[model samples]
Target: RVTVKYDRRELQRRLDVEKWIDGRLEELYRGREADMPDEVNIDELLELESEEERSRKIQGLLKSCTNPTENFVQELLVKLRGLHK
Candidate 1:
């Protein structure tokens, strides 16, 4: 078996991005209760940042809440897609 090592610097960069995403989501959900699902875990989402990992994180984020209508979700998705660009 072969072992592959990931770079610490790259990991840090992703972690930073995850933090920014978390903060952005929180900011968007501010002043709202149901819009911010309590079950969403930012740390867990960070783990799936790599393409090799399951895309469940994004799905979970997209379905994180069911409030304020679909328009809010679409806006959030656009911002998230921006992150990948």
Candidate 2:
């Protein structure tokens, strides 16, 4: 019932972090940008009400590509954590 809007500064903060993530992803995913869908996966993430489903979706993306290192997934998960709180 209560959908509070975020403040300008907070929104900017999110944008910056999101940009930081996208840049890294392009570097990691390399030439396979075609595989990237859902606007870097953020749009799909919010609808994932249960943490289980969210992780499932996120993990599914990372697991599909063997090119990404464990460290890449590590940082991506840490970055995705921002939108949760």
Candidate 3:
């Protein structure tokens, strides 16, 4: 048998931030009117100081995602662990 370990707090933090960012993006793209999503949240990504920062944010979410919410962070851990069997 093989055991896998993960950092729960880090994973949770990444997931929480990803969800917030996704919601903001959805509002911006679909709302398309006077009522935009909170400016601060949207501005964070836009104001990313460098390419690395922007890429890291996008990449972090991409790593956590796998077909919508079905393969979330926890699910990804399970899926990865299964590979050891």
Q: How much lDDT does each candidate structure score?
A: 0.34, 0.41, 0.31
| Cα error of candidate 3 at position 33, Å | 17
Q: After superposing candidate 3 on the true structure, give the runs of residues whose Cα lies further than 4 Å from its correct spot.
A: 1-9, 29-85
Candidate 2 regions off by >4 Å? 1-14, 39-42, 62-85
**What's model 2's TM-score?**
0.40
Candidate 1: tens digits of C-alpha lDDT, residues 17-59: 3343354454544444235442232233333455322234434
Weakest ten-residue segment in model 2 by summed lDDT: 1-10
Error of 1 at 77 (Å): 20
**Native-vs-model 2 lDDT?**
0.41
Number of backbone collisions per candidate: 0, 0, 0
On residues 1-85, what C-alpha lDDT tens digit does candidate 3 reach at each position? 0111222344454344334434433442234322322222112333444634433443343332212332222232333222211
Across 2-76, the per-residue lDDT of candidate 2 in tens digits comes to: 001211234454454444446654554456544553234433453446654544555565554423333333333
RMSD of each: 12.2, 8.7, 15.0
The model with the greatest TM-score is: 2
